[PDB]
RNA sequence: AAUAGUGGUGCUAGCAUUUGCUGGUUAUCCACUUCUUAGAGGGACUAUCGGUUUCAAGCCGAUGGAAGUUUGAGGCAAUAACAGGUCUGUGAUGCCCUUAGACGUUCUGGGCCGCACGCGCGCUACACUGACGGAGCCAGCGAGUCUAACCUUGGCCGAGAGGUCUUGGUAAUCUUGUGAAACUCCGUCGUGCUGGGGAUAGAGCAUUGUAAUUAUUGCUCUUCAACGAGGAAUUCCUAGUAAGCGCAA
């Protein structure tokens, strides 16, 4: 009767979890969300306006969940595209960096995900009773 | 101790190892339970193997598998190769041959597929 | 959903009619570039038969607003029966009146 | 700009057969999210009954 | 009397099990704690050039093959066991290696 | 959604600096119908108006049309970085500006006239090409 | 280099040997390379 | 010659001498800032078509 | 698409006339013979000549 | 088999908790080879039955079998007029200036790079089996730094592009699970050459070297121009094959 992180939908689980984080509002959200785009080869600032930056920030604690670690370099090669050039064929994509530095730092104000010793960013007890705790938040959803 | 062995199916280099453990029954593909794999059309295809026997020889069962290689078309192929025929271990260290072949002829009745792997390797080309 | 009993059904009918019985031969004849006496087997006539129900889909559903699935749809309760509206045997009957002049 | 949307589809919905996108367009000002949102506003009316749905398209037929 | 490690990496497969034999035979004379030889996976070298010395004619091509073979042995024994029979198993062709990494 | 049943009052045509817009579209892909402003360009200005995503001409205040030229002609008092305009450090002024439809054409000839006939501050071999072989 | 047989281009660069490969077809045998497949 | 920026150090001057074969008459004109040396020499005399009716090639063949 | 090559041909009747009473008619046994009482290169060969031999000896068994 | 991997015993965190399902890492230790890699061998012969044929060589079905198209794919195998085979080939040609050489270098701008049509072997199309936006996230064979700048991950600033601080890697250990793309769900869009398609262009920021104008390349914003499936004709590619999709040397 109870549960890991690991056997509950994988787009549904975002969207429930993404509009509590919208009851938050506890987000360093800068100032040029509106402008920047998550990376060259995409063409268009996203549709959603507000809820995207809940929507990466809530997927990024959700890889790290079964990883060990993550760094930065390895959510720039992760996120679904394939680079545009015109008239010649394409190639794959690679993702903005300063969209993602600060996403990273904006979970260590409310104890999340930390800096492991062998040199990357993970979760430790701080997540490991609470992230949990309300991914068992979201088994009210289930029903 | 506890009755276990360790089967294995492949499918155009994508492999999918399995362990074979008694207990309630538990069937947890790569760290997760079956009904949620992501080629949504396939669902039942991984159904196919437990869905031709009826649901009763497993509350005696553990079965924890997990893969690597292939995309992700090949992997769904790859887990109910080593499944099905990994149901069998028990059944021929175990449980009697009687008990044996008559799933046996089961499935291959039914998917020469389900027991022997394929043979249809790729090609090299202009040389 | 559209006021039917079985929908493996409607194409197993379907294809009954768009066997075609007869045939052209797919020869000239050494200049005189004719058409002679031939019939079809019947494992030949089924590959032909399914064949011609699908390529009218696609410009069915070329270009127009609907959907592949909503042309499907109509196509083969119009195969269904012996209509002769729908391209999918309205090209297949034409071969074989001409068929039954050329032999 | 205020009666075609009003008693075309609220009056003269239960007519036909099924609902698909392809009855709503048969009007050339019904545009694609115009008929998108006919049947987003009737399914909370009740009168769809549904059959399958998924974000290309939906299977539904009315009450 | 420190462990030891060591390598041998060549290119005359028939003249590599020889050698591994008699590493293996006289410790076992004497009884030494081993690990048996692992066999690393090969290595191929390849390059493919065009066949002709000047340019004009048909084109496809070569491809040449070179094969590196390589496995390695972990042991421990006194030192003067080893600095005689590392002396005595020499080779044309073949290359031996000694490490003692023991960090 | 709903029925929302607006009197009409939509216009075909409609007049920012002699732009005539088939305004029954989405006013993002309104502004590109003008020359100089593209969705990448007119993508945020919307953003900034502050409005509905979804609206077309019938139902826009008239205060807000006034307001998108507004933002317009003050570019950089509101938030728009320096990677967000057309021309940028000019050869005879060095700010930064942008452009309107009807002034592409402005700082557009006598900044090629000056490369096509005076052999200007760098257009000395630049200054065949859209004479000879692409006038 | 230009090494041998009128050649100066084409060059092997790689795993530093460097041989102009006009001459390399009757050098690649005692280097110790051999075509199989 | 080809490779140096303009200095202001310029006001009419017919900079240039032989430095090979394909001179470089630069005189200055009269004050035109922030450029190259180079684009004023001769590179490539612009003729038109001597006998280019045959524009660019042929067709497909047939004879 | 396989017919076999008279040196499979030859030695398989020669091999027929020296040891007639030791061959046998299932071909697994004489598999392990042919070693014996003859030199076979390599092993595909051996394979295809007690192959045909058998085939061969199932005729004595009617003509 | 610490240069692969699971199986426990632990230190150890979640834990619905309550037996429990996920974690935990150097060394907590022991036991293992199924998956992995590489040596030694084995296994298929058209086997066994049924047809068919001068009853011959064989060819068709059949059930077994990892495998029954020479089992799949290659390498290797000489009769001949292309006076293209030339490396300090020598011609083992006597005129090329063949010795103020018109053969070297440093030290110089100009070779493949000029308007109006291609037989140049597919590239980006002509769209709702589609674009755009959110997610879900899977691989194979190859490569690499000392007399020296090769791979590059974290922490760094920035919108990219990049810049700075570090490491790791002479090689199954590190880059690298090379988180590739098509495809996959949830959306937005609505058939008009519109948000399909960006072909010529002007404004800008960067890097690489002695040096990028005649844009060497790369990211910004603008501009969106031929292009509605192609006349007569005619094709490097064979069942995991034809086609899409890669982005490794």
Redesign the interface.
Known sequence: PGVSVRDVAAQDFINAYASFLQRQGKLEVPGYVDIVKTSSGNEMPPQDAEGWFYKRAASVARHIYMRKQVGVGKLNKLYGGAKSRGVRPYKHIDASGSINRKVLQALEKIGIVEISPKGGRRISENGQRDLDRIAAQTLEEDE | AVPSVQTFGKKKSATAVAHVKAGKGLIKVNGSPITLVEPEILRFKVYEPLLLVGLDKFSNIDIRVRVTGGGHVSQVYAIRQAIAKGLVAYHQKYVDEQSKNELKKAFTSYDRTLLIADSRRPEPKKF | VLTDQNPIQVVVDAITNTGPREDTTRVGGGGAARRQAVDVSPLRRVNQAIALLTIGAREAAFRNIKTIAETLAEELINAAKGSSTSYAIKKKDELERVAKSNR | ???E??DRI?KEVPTY??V???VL?DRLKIGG?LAR?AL??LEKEGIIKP?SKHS??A?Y?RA | IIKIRITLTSTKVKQLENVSSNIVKNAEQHNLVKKGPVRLPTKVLKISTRKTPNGEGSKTWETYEMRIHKRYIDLEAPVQIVKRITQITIEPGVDVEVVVASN | SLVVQEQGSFQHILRLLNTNVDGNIKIVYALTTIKGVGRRYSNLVCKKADVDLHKRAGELTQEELERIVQIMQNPTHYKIPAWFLNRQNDITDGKDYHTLANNVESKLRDDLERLKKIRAHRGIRHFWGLRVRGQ | QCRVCSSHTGLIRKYGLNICRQCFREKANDIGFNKFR | MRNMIIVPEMIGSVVGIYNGKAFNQVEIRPEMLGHYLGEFSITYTPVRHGRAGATTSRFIPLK | GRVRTKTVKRASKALIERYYPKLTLDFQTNKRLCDEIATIQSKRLRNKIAGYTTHLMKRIQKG
Do not use: G, M, P
Request: glycine residues 0%.
């Open positions: 700009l205020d009666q949307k009003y609220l057969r099924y698909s996108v392809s367009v999210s949102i987003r506003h059959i290309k398209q299977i037929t």
